[PDB]
Amino acid sequence: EYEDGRGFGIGELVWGKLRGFSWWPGRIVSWWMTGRSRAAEGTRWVMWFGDGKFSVVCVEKLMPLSSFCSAFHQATYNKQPMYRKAIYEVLQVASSRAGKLFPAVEVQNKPMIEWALGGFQPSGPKGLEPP
């Protein structure tokens, strides 16, 4: 599965872009997790954080989580509680992988967002990879 040389393999935390919606946090899953069928070449199944919906997304509309500064939209964050939830979730998962520890969603998000914005120090983007 996904051996087409386009990257974004299973378990990778990503930003995904559908028409009519902001870049949204998700993770790449296998097709059998979706309760659907195989994705076409050059596309991936992503499970969105926030509500856990599944979508087929072309790799051209995917960015790694590390592209946080380009994808993160402050206006969306302010107005959409599910976006704050999605940010919370993807960064909880990311920080667990990187071994980045932090000392209700809006509160806990701030150090995690700062971490993301600062280049995911000390691990960098490498710490965000599936174990």
Residue numbers in the entry: 9 to 111, 124 to 151
Question: Could you pull the original sentences from the published paper?
Answer:
The PWWP domain comprises 100–130 amine acids and is often present in chromatin-associated proteins. Our structures revealed that the overall fold of the PWWP domain consists of three motifs: a canonical β-barrel core, an insertion motif between the second and third β-strands and a C-terminal α-helix bundle. The canonical β-barrel core harbors an aromatic cage constructed by three aromatic residues, which is a signature feature of the Tudor domain “Royal family”. Taken together, similar to other members in the ‘Royal family’, PWWP domain also exhibits methyllysine histone binding ability.
DNMT3A and DNMT3B are DNA methyltransferase, which are essential for de novo methylation and mammalian development. The PWWP domains of the DNA methyltransfearses DNMT3A and DNMT3B are essential for targeting DNA methylation to heterochromatin regions through their chromatin binding ability. DNMT3A had been shown to bind histone H3K36me3, but we were not able to obtain its cocrystals with H3K36me3, Nevertheless, we found a bis-tris buffer molecule in both the DNMT3A and DNMT3B structures. The bis-tris molecule resides in the conserved aromatic cage of the PWWP domains. Superposition of the DNMT3A and DNMT3B with the BRPF1 and HDGF2 complex structures shows that the bis-tris molecule is bound in the position occupied by the tri-methyl ammonium group of the methyllysine. The bis-tris molecule is bound to DNMT3A and DNMT3B in slightly different conformations. In the DNMT3A structure, the bis-tris molecule forms two hydrogen bonds with the D333 residue from DNMT3A, and three hydrogen bonds with residues G298, L300 and S304 through a conserved water molecule.
